[PDB]
Design brief:
part of a larger assembly; 2 chains; two-stranded antiparallel ribbon; mainly beta; DNA-directed RNA polymerase subunit beta' (chain B); about 160 residues
Amino acid sequence: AAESSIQVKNKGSIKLSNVKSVVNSSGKLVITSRNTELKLIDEFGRTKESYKVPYGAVLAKGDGEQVAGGETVANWDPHTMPVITEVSGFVRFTDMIDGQTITRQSSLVVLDSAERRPALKIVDAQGNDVAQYFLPGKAIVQLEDGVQISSGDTLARIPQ
Amino acid sequence: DGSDPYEEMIPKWRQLNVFEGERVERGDVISDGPEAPHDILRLRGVHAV
C-alpha cells in the first residue's frame, strides 16, 4: 500500500514512547529515533493497537490526546526519511562543484561518492558557525545557501 | 564506546540506517532486514530468542 497514513480503529488516547521531541516549523514534532511505537489507552491499561513509526515522522495529534479514532494521528513520507536541521537559519554549502556535483531537475544534487561528501553546519543567520551534514549517494538538497530555513524542516533527499 | 572500539565491515551493498550516533544501544538495528536467531541470542539475550 502506497498510503502512509495510519488509521485508528477505536477511540484510544495515543501513548507515544521511546521518541525524540524536536521542534519543527509548526506546532507538531518530528521524531529522530528509529525505534518508535504507539500505544492506545481509552479506559484501561490494555493496549489495542501498536503499529510503528519511522524516523522523521510528523504526528498529527500530540501525545496523550484522546483521539476519537478513524483519523490519522501521524504522517510520514513512505519513500524518503527526512533529516531534520539542528540549527535554524541559512545553510552553509561547502565545496559546491557545478557540472560534476550539480544535477538540474533551486533543486540541485549535492554530490556523488562514485564521481568524487563535505560536511558543514547550518549557519545561524547568514554565515555564522554553530552539527555535521552527511551526503550519501544521490543525496540532493533543494535549498540553496542563505535560504534561512527553520529548524525541523527538510527538503526531498532523493534516496538512491 | 569509551573503550575497545567494535570493528565491523559493511560490504556497502546495504544501506546504513542510523546516520548519526544517537547513542546506539546494544541490540539496535544498524541495518534494516530480517535478523537471524543466532545474533539475537548473543546480544539481546536468551529470553529474546
